[PDB]
Design a protein around this ligand. Structure first.
Ligand SMILES: Nc1ncnc2c1ncn2[C@@H]1O[C@H](COP(=O)(O)OP(=O)(O)OP(=O)(O)O)[C@@H](O)[C@H]1O
Ligand SMILES: Nc1ncnc2c1ncn2[C@@H]1O[C@H](COP(=O)(O)OP(=O)(O)OP(=O)(O)O)[C@@H](O)[C@H]1O
Ligand SMILES: Nc1ncnc2c1ncn2[C@@H]1O[C@H](COP(=O)(O)OP(=O)(O)O)[C@@H](O)[C@H]1O
Ligand SMILES: Nc1ncnc2c1ncn2[C@@H]1O[C@H](COP(=O)(O)OP(=O)(O)O)[C@@H](O)[C@H]1O
Ligand SMILES: [Mg+2]
Ligand SMILES: [Mg+2]
Ligand SMILES: [Mg+2]
Ligand SMILES: [Mg+2]
Lengths: 128, 140, 413, 228, 404, 239, 26, 253
């Protein structure tokens, strides 16, 4: 069929690996965010609660990344760790460049470029 | 662990009509045979007195977990559907029973397992010290 | 929530706005259809289908000899003999539906002209032998053979030069000039198979050779051989070949061998295996000993890859001719053939059309011609023109199963 | 089982280059003629929409002041061949301070062509006609995707190649004049076309020894057409 | 002369053109009823006032008794000698019987059914026709009610099929002058629920030749030899009659790709398909018979059934566009009482994926929902509820607009 | 069937993968553009706002420089990648040679970039079609339209997206041989061209103009309805 | 390749029985 | 299941009793019903209860009776069934577990199936084909509606498709009251509390709860029923399991 690596197109179909990635994240954790005057809030659901886990983590679903921005996450832990470290690296590099905090917009475009690059070259799965 | 012996013990002291049928007997070569024999055995049991039906192994035809895309998978699924229909369907029959015995039953189709169709679920675990003591004394 | 319509509401619903002629209408249609039923029953049929002759033909023979014919004769069921004991008057017979009996001759028949292996008449009671009968000539095989000349000429096949040459070499030349082969020292083949894509042009060539054949031609229905009773297909096969051998210079033609059989498989319990027997009865009868002679057989099919390899043995099927799509001169010639019987504008060139149908067989070109005629009909015209064919080509060849019609040759300029 | 450029056949026939050979079949026709006075070249335009800009789509491009090319087949690959031709010509002029013969230009182009799998991709899918005037006089060469040289006196490429080849064979002779060759080629192009010939479907090119410039004809094609 | 037109049409008279509770219709159906009663009265008087009868010529009873009372039917197979033919019975038992007189010895031919005696078993007559009650039943004789007026607008397709099957009959002057053979085979293909059988009904309603209708998975019997023989007899009975037409519906049950496999039953299916394929276009002749063949998926057909020469025109029925929806709505609600509020514009334009049967169901559901609250006139909200609440099973695709 | 690889030739000589990516553009919202005597204008539609999120980050028309414009169809991310690369390229050219970038040069560069993701395996072709509009060569306007295969052309009135064929049909008859002056009449032509929105929300049209002189100009939702009113006023003259 | 196949059937030929002859010959 | 029984009654019984009503209002009578939902929710109760109050001739082709050995006869059984339904004029045909026939039409070749498809096409033709039937109704029942062939779901053959959702709180309490009639309940047992202790109950297992409490009473040789018995029955009937691996769970964040 057309369900091998992401490079091939279907005759009328879109990319399918991307469809599978879209559907997969459906059954991950639950998070949401709301704007507010003079503020904003993020809510996250904790899954898989048990008494014997030591709960030593400062947080599990939220990471203060740069200095003034926090991000949630849903999907696979392995990719999550890589992406968060990479974000922190990008923001710090920009701050070195311009002695000025990142303008809360361009790093999102940078990481999105990193993500879409994986769907262009063969031999790698898209992030989930 | 000793479940077929319990089926035998029931067979010994019963006063009703007994049938034992191996599950894999239902697989056939020609089309439509398996459901026909399921229908026929239930008709046999119904005609007679209060009866008991024993089915040896079911691990073969016991789960869907998917839709049947190729041929000859639909035959298996159709056999299962016929069994479900025959056991609790339009035409209710009274004074009949069914005995089922398999290995671990986590993978069974939940169409079977709803009450009204397979009410009792029973475990036969491994022996412990007390059980082993009894078995040894009895055998010796 | 919701509620259910009550009796009173049903009564009033059939009440407002009924109009003054409601039931007064419907009762009419009612009795209309009823009287239709009655009038059609009062009509049945008549037959007059017994074949009785005019009374003059009956003559007074009805009393004189027809009355004197029921009682004198007997049915005398007919059977065959298999093993004639010689100098020992006991014979053996089989009804081919009954069992085998030991029997003898009757009083008046000489015991000399009773050669073993022929049909005989037999009494119902004592199973005696009474009269001989000629060997059976099968009722269906009599009209099996064409005995007619379809009017298609070698001049009407374009774009198949080589295949026509080979077919001629196999069939005609040994039947008319049988000296070249013995002069040089070769032997003429006796079997040709035809294959190609559907529509290429096979059965047409078969029909063409049946025009200038100057010999017996036999059309064979592939699906007629198989039968409901056991042991019938093989019987008809052997009757076919024997009756063919009776006369000289007869041709045999088959169609869709893949109908009769092209594979052999185990099991098939019950009904299937019968056809197997049938095909075997052909093969061993196709060859063996005693060269058959000037009897030629043709095999034609569209699905060659499903054939039993036992058919391709040297001696059974000797030559295999392939039919291929016509290249370029084939297309111009085919257009010139099918468009010489319609009214057309005299200054149109057909090579242009030959370009615009790259992968097409004779069927598609013929349909293009008729389609151009129809587009000429739609508007009130008497003579078709260039644009007609140019539109019909887009209508037929390309239009079916198109792709990227809107993108077109954007990138191919 | 020809799903590989790097694989032979039980009879020894590469089954990938053949496909590119026939891929030219659905381009657009183009005719070329060599004559003692010069080289003539004609093409069909096959315009798609009246809303197109006619000059955006072309078939004749002048590599140098004394050489020209005609193209059929795929569109994209033609660019990659043409720019290499131009670059090579300029490099040779810079090194040797003269103009090379057309034959060497064809040699360089073909040397680029035959590397579809030689190095360490699909073969190019175009056919080219080269026409120019070297020290030996007028010259014309034909180039196909297998990378094969050939010199032709008169040649037609694209669809209707064999359709026009037979017609062209019967009228050519060596004792020929450029004026008559142009008319003959236009007649052939009229016969093979499916649209009524006019001045917005063709575009000519002529090159002469002493008139190495002016490799076009523009809007005087009307009087060239009307006298047919 | 063959069996001739053998026309199949009740089609008494349709003129109820007032289509309301007017007097014109009442007087017209009054005329119809009284003509029918008049003809019935005539036939009663025809059958009641017969005074003449002898009808035995003092010998007809003689011939009747000379032949046995329970005559049986057998199959002649040869005629070796005059007055001594050879026949056979059902069980395949041949008998060297005699031939008596009073049997026109002209029309007998090997393969023809004959009438035989019991006690002596001689030939005493010839059975004129033998058609099993599986082919005569396929024929139609009462035309279905619809006509072209009910079709919701398919001008291209209607004109196409009319040039196919109807025009060569009424005005066959052009084709000879041009020198063309009219097309004989038509395929109707497309999505389900679009109107493929409506054209079959509408054509059968108004015609002059015999109509035969067959549904796909019916050419099949289990005795290994009945399928192809039944097909052969079908085409024989069609051709001996008038310029008939045959309608095979839901084909894909019969023809699919002709591959090679194990089981014998599937071999039988393939054998039957291939026999039909020969019957349609094989050796010498075809006759004056047209074939219409209808299916809802076409790619899975054997390439040998679809090639031109056998099937000449293919007709695709696409989903309706916004022009046609207004026509469909105007037709299916014509005989409905209806209120001044409703506008069909919103219903037709809001949705973009539905077919004729869907529109009919919307109409009936809305009318019934209006009845639910004890009313006759229909309003806009009823149509809204009808469209949205049911008549829609769903599908998903192209998530969240990857394209912008 | 015989596809599934980007470097194989079908028996009759096609590149089925390029053709498969060709149709992937038609899933996007339509967009058109025309040039005039003084003004060049390009229009987009099918915005279909989801009324619950901001609209300043859903831009579909972007300026590759101060004096050139581009629109696109097809999917999104590839468009962003191409946009960034083109901006970098044109600025670099202005650096290496002081002249501004001609409208043709940047289009040819984009064509080459889209061309070079076709030969090798392991690289999925881009799935967008672009419209380039400029006037930079001595005050003269032009537009160009590119293809996922990698071939560009020069037009005078184009239309891309889901349902461009009908817009074509309209254009080849309604575009006048009259060299169109009175820029407002050109804008009227564009509005009547986008009039065939599949639903005609009235407020689902957006325009962008460039009059040989200044930078980008964007219309605002107050003149669109006055143009609509004038269209109705002209249309009421049927009798 | 699993099997869920089917098949046709041939008839049972044996059906005939003898009957008393009733010839009248003096 | 009040709404469902109202709509069912409407499709089945109304057009038989009052055809002139549909002659008025100018519409055509519906003829198709389909029932779907999760297992054990009451699909076959409606079929039986309809048979009880029908006042018509109730046929019953169910399961896989129509798949036969030889080729062909499996089809003609359908035709003969429908003509038998025409002999007795008003009638209802009730299929069951219909996705055994006509799941979806597959390809040809040595894969999928043919014979069942021939039979299904026969049935398909038989109810919306060339010839129009009248006064014959159908009912079908199935789970997994989404796989059914799409040539049967069109509004020509099937008109109303009805879903049977698992009961909510009120339905659970009411079913508990129906199925605890003949019991002998002590006092001070609050069936609302037991009703709310069973989130997402299938519906057929409320009978299980009742019978199990009964057997607990029987084993001890008593006729009472107390609340502890009901609670323990609740625990026994509701049983599930999870991935004890703890690694399969954690890989998803
Ligand atoms: N070379 C040809 N010259 C003339 N007519 C041709 C040619 N090839 C095909 N035809 C036309 O093809 C039509 C039918 O061809 P034909 O019956 O021989 O096909 P076939 O290959 O036997 O097909 P099938 O195998 O399906 O029976 C005729 O109308 C005939 O005119
Ligand atoms: N254009 C139309 N005008 C009028 N009625 C139409 C139209 N299209 C469809 N219908 C309706 O569709 C029904 C006709 O059935 P149709 O011919 O579409 O079935 P079909 O295509 O054979 O379907 P299936 O695949 O189920 O056999 C009737 O209810 C008819 O009123
Ligand atoms: N409690 C027991 N007393 C006596 N024999 C036992 C007992 N449990 C198991 N067995 C022995 O183990 C064997 C298992 O019996 P069976 O029921 O056939 O095995 P399974 O449980 O796998 O069907 C029996 O033959 C029996 O001899
Ligand atoms: N809503 C309900 N009311 C009463 N009994 C129910 C209900 N739902 C399920 N049941 C019980 O379920 C059993 C039948 O379930 P059933 O309708 O056969 O499920 P299905 O038909 O889907 O197999 C009956 O014993 C019935 O008592
Ligand atoms: Mg055991
Ligand atoms: Mg043929
Ligand atoms: Mg239909
Ligand atoms: Mg059920």
């Amino acid at each position: 069929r057309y369900d091998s690596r992401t490079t091939i197109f279907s005759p009328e179909g879109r990319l399918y690996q991307v469809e599978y990635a879209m559907e997969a994240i459906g059954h991950a954790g639950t998070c949401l965010g709301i704007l507010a005057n003079d503020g904003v809030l993020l809510a996250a659901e904790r899954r898989n609660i048990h008494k014997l886990l030591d709960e030593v983590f400062f947080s599990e679903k939220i990471y203060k990344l740069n200095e003034d921005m926090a991000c949630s996450v849903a999907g696979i832990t392995s990719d999550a760790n890589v992406l968060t470290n990479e974000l922190r690296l990008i923001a710090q590099r920009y701050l070195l460049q311009y002695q000025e905090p990142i303008p809360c917009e361009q790093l999102v475009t940078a990481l999105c470029d990193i993500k879409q690059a994986y769907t262009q070259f063969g031999g790698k799965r898209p992030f989930g | 662990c000793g479940k077929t012996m319990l089926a035998k013990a029931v067979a010994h002291h019963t006063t009703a009509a007994f049938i034992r049928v191996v599950g894999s007997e239902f697989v056939q070569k020609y089309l439509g045979e398996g459901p026909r024999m399921v229908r026929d055995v239930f008709r046999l049991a119904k005609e007679n007195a209060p009866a008991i039906i024993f089915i040896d192994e079911i691990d073969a035809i016991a789960t869907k977990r998917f839709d049947a895309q190729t041929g000859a998978d639909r035959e298996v699924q159709r056999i299962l559907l016929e069994l479900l229909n025959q056991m609790d369907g339009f035409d209710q029959n009274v004074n009949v029973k069914v005995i089922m015995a398999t290995n671990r039953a986590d993978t069974l189709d939940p169409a079977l397992l709803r009450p009204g169709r397979l009410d009792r679920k029973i475990e036969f675990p491994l022996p412990d010290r007390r059980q082993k003591r009894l078995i040894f004394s009895t055998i010796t | 929530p919701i509620r259910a319509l009550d009796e009173g509401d049903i009564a009033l619903l059939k009440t407002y706005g009924q109009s003054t002629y409601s039931r007064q209408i419907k009762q009419v249609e009612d009795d209309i259809q009823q009287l239709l039923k009655k009038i059609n029953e009062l009509t049945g049929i008549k037959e007059s289908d017994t074949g009785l002759a005019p009374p003059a033909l009956w003559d007074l023979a009805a009393d004189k000899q027809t009355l004197q014919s029921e009682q004198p004769l007997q049915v005398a069921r007919c059977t065959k003999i298999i093993n004639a004991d010689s100098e020992d008057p006991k014979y053996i017979i089989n009804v081919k539906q009954f069992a085998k009996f030991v029997v003898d001759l009757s009083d008046q028949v000489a015991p000399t002209d009773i050669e073993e292996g022929m049909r005989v008449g037999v009494d119902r009671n004592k199973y005696q032998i009474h009269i001989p009968l000629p060997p059976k000539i099968d009722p269906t095989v009599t009209m099996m053979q064409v005995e007619e000349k379809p009017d298609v000429t070698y001049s009407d096949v374009g774009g198949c030069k080589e295949q026509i040459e080979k077919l001629r070499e196999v069939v005609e030349t040994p039947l008319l000039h049988p000296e070249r082969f013995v002069n040089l020292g070769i032997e003429p083949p006796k079997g040709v198979l035809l294959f190609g894509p559907p529509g290429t042009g096979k059965t047409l060539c078969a029909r063409a050779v049946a025009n200038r054949t100057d010999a017996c031609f036999i059309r064979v229905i592939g699906s007629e051989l198989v039968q409901k009773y056991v042991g019938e297909g093989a019987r008809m096969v052997r009757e076919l070949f024997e009756m063919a051998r009776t006369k000289k210079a007869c041709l045999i033609f088959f169609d869709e061998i893949d109908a009769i059989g092209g594979a052999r498989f185990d099991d098939g319990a019950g009904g299937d295996n019968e056809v197997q027997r049938t095909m075997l009865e052909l093969i061993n009868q196709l060859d063996g000993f005693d060269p058959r002679g000037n009897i030629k057989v043709l095999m034609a099919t569209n699905r060659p890859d499903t054939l039993d390899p036992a058919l391709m043995r040297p001696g059974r099927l000797d030559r295999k001719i392939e039919f291929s799509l016509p290249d370029l001169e084939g297309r111009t010639h085919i257009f010139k053939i099918h468009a010489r019987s319609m009214s057309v504008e005299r200054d149109i060139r057909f090579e242009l059309l030959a370009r615009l149908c790259p992968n097409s067989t004779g069927a598609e070109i013929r349909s293009v011609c008729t389609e151009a005629g129809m587009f000429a009909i739609r508007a009130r015209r008497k003579i078709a023109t260039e644009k007609d064919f140019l539109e019909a080509v887009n209508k037929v060849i390309k239009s079916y199963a198109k792709f990227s019609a809107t993108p077109r040759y954007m990138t191919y300029n | 089982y020809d799903r590989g450029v790097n694989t032979f056949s039980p009879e020894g026939r590469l089954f990938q280059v053949e496909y590119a050979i026939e891929a030219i079949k659905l381009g657009s026709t183009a005719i070329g003629i060599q004559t003692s006075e010069g080289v003539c070249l004609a093409v069909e335009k096959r315009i798609t929409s009246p809303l197109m800009e006619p000059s955006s789509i072309e078939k004749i491009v002048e590599i140098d002041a004394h050489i020209g090319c005609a193209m059929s087949g795929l569109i994209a690959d033609a660019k990659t061949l043409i720019d290499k031709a131009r670059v090579e010509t300029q490099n040779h002029w810079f090194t040797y301070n003269e103009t090379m013969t057309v034959e060497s230009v064809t040699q360089a182009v073909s040397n680029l062509a035959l590397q579809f799998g030689e190095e360490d991709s699909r073969p190019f899918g175009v056919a080219l006609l080269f026409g120019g005037v070297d020290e030996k006089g007028p010259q014309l060469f034909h180039m196909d995707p297998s990378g094969t040289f050939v010199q032709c006196d008169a040649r037609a490429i694209g669809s209707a190649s064999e359709g026009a080849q037979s017609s062209l064979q019967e009228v050519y002779h060596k004792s020929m004049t450029l004026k008559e060759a142009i008319k003959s080629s236009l007649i052939i192009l009229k016969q093979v076309m499916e649209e009524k010939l006019n001045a917005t479907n063709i575009e000519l090119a002529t090159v002469q020894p002493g008139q190495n410039f002016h490799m076009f004809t523009k809007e005087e094609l009307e009087e060239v057409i009307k006298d047919i | 002369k063959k069996k001739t037109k053998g026309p199949d049409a009740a089609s008494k008279l349709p003129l109820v053109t007032p289509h309301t509770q007017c007097r014109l219709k009442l007087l017209k159906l009054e005329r119809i009823k009284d003509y029918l009663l008049m003809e019935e009265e005539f036939i009663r008087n025809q059958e009641q006032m017969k005074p003449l009868e002898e009808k035995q010529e003092e010998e007809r009873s003689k011939v009747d008794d000379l032949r046995g009372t329970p005559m049986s039917v057998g199959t002649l197979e040869e005629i070796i000698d005059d007055n001594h033919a050879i026949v056979s019975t059902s069980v395949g038992s041949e008998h060297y019987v005699s031939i008596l007189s009073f049997v026109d010895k002209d029309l007998l031919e090997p393969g023809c059914s004959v009438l035989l005696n019991h006690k002596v078993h001689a030939v005493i007559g010839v059975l004129m026709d033998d058609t099993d009650p599986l082919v005569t039943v396929m024929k139609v004789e009462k035309a279905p009610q619809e006509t072209y007026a009910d079709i919701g607008g398919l001008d291209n397709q209607i004109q196409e099929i009319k040039e196919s099957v109807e025009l060569p009959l009424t005005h066959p002057e052009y084709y000879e002058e041009m020198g063309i053979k009219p097309p004989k085979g038509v395929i109707l293909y497309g999505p389900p629920g679009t109107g493929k059988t409506l054209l079959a009904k509408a054509v059968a309603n108004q015609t002059s030749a015999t109509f035969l209708r067959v549904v796909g998975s019916e050419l099949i019997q289990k005795y290994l030899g009945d399928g192809p023989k039944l097909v052969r007899e079908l085409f024989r009975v069609a051709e001996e009659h008038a310029p008939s037409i045959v309608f095979i519906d839901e084909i894909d049950a019969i023809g699919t790709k002709r591959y090679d496999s194990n089981s014998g039953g599937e071999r039988e299916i393939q054998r039957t398909m291939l026999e039909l394929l020969n019957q349609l276009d094989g050796f010498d002749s075809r006759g004056d018979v047209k074939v219409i063949m209808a299916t809802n998926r076409i790619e899975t057909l054997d390439p040998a059934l679809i090639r031109p020469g056998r099937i000449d025109r293919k007709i695709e029925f696409p989903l309706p566009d916004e022009k046609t929806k207004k026509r469909i709505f105007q037709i299916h609600t014509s005989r409905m009482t209806l209120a001044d509020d409703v506008t069909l514009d919103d219903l037709i334009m809001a949705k973009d994926d539905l077919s004729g049967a869907d529109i009919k169901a919307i109409c009936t559901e809305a009318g019934l929902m209006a009845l639910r609250e004890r009313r006759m006139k229909v309003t806009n909200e009823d149509f809204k509820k009808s469209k949205e609440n049911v008549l829609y099973k769903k599908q998903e695709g192209t998530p969240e607009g990857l394209y912008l | 069937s015989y596809d599934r690889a980007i470097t194989v030739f079908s028996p009759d000589g096609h590149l089925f993968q390029v053709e498969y990516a060709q149709e992937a553009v038609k899933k996007g919202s339509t967009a058109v553009g025309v040039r005039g005597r003084d003004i060049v204008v390009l229009g987009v539609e099918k915005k279909s706002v989801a009324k619950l999120q901001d609209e300043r980050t859903v831009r579909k028309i972007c300026a590759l420089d101060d004096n050139v414009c581009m629109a696109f169809a097809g999917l999104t991310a590839d468009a962003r990648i191409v946009i960034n690369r083109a901006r970098v390229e044109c600025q670099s050219h202005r650096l290496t040679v002081e002249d501004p970038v001609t409208v043709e040069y940047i289009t040819r560069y984009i064509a080459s970039l889209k061309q070079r993701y076709t030969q090798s395996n392991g690289r999925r072709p881009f799935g967008i079609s672009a419209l380039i509009v400029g006037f930079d060569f001595d005050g003269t306007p032009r537009l160009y339209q590119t293809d996922p295969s990698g071939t560009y052309h020069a037009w005078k009135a184009n239309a891309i997206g889901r349902g461009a064929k009908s817009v074509r049909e309209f254009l080849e008859k309604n575009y006048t041989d009259e060299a169109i002056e009175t820029d407002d009449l050109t804008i009227k032509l564009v509005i009547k061209a986008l009039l065939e929105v599949v639903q005609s929300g009235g407020k689902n049209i957006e325009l962008a103009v460039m009059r040989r002189d200044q930078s980008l100009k964007i219309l605002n939702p107050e003149e669109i309805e006055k143009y609509v009113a004038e269209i109705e006023k002209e249309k009421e003259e049927n009798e | 390749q699993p099997s869920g196949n089917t098949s046709s059937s041939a008839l049972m030929q044996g059906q005939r029985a003898p009957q008393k002859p009733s010839q009248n010959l003096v | 299941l009040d709404k469902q029984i109202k709509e069912i009654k409407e499709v089945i019984e109304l057009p038989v009793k009052h055809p002139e009503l549909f002659e008025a209002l100018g519409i055509a009578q519906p003829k198709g019903v389909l029932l779907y939902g999760p297992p054990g929710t009451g699909k076959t109760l409606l079929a039986r209860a309809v048979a009880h109050h029908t006042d018509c001739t109730f046929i019953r082709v169910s399961g896989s009776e129509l798949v036969q050995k030889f080729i062909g006869e499996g089809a003609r059984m359908v035709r003969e069934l429908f003509v038998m339904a025409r002999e007795h004029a008003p009638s209802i045909i009730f299929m069951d577990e219909i996705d055994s026939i006509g799941s979806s039409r597959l390809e040809g070749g040595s894969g999928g199936d043919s014979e069942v498809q021939r039979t299904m096409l026969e049935l398909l033709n038989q109810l919306d084909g060339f010839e129009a039937t009248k006064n014959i109704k159908v009912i079908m029942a199935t789970n997994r509606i989404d796989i059914l062939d799409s040539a049967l779901l069109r509004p020509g053959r099937i008109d109303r498709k009805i879903e049977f959702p698992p009961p909510n709180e009120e339905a659970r309490l009411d079913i508990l009251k129906i199925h605890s009639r003949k019991m002998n309940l002590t006092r001070g047992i609050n069936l609302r509390k037991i009703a709310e202790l069973m989130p997402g109950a299938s519906g057929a297992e409320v009978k299980g709860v009742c019978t199990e409490a009964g057997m607990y009473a029987l084993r001890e040789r008593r006729v009472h029923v107390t609340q502890e018995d009901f609670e323990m029955a609740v625990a026994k009937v509701m049983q599930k399991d999870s991935e004890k691996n703890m690694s399969i769970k954690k890989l998803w964040k």
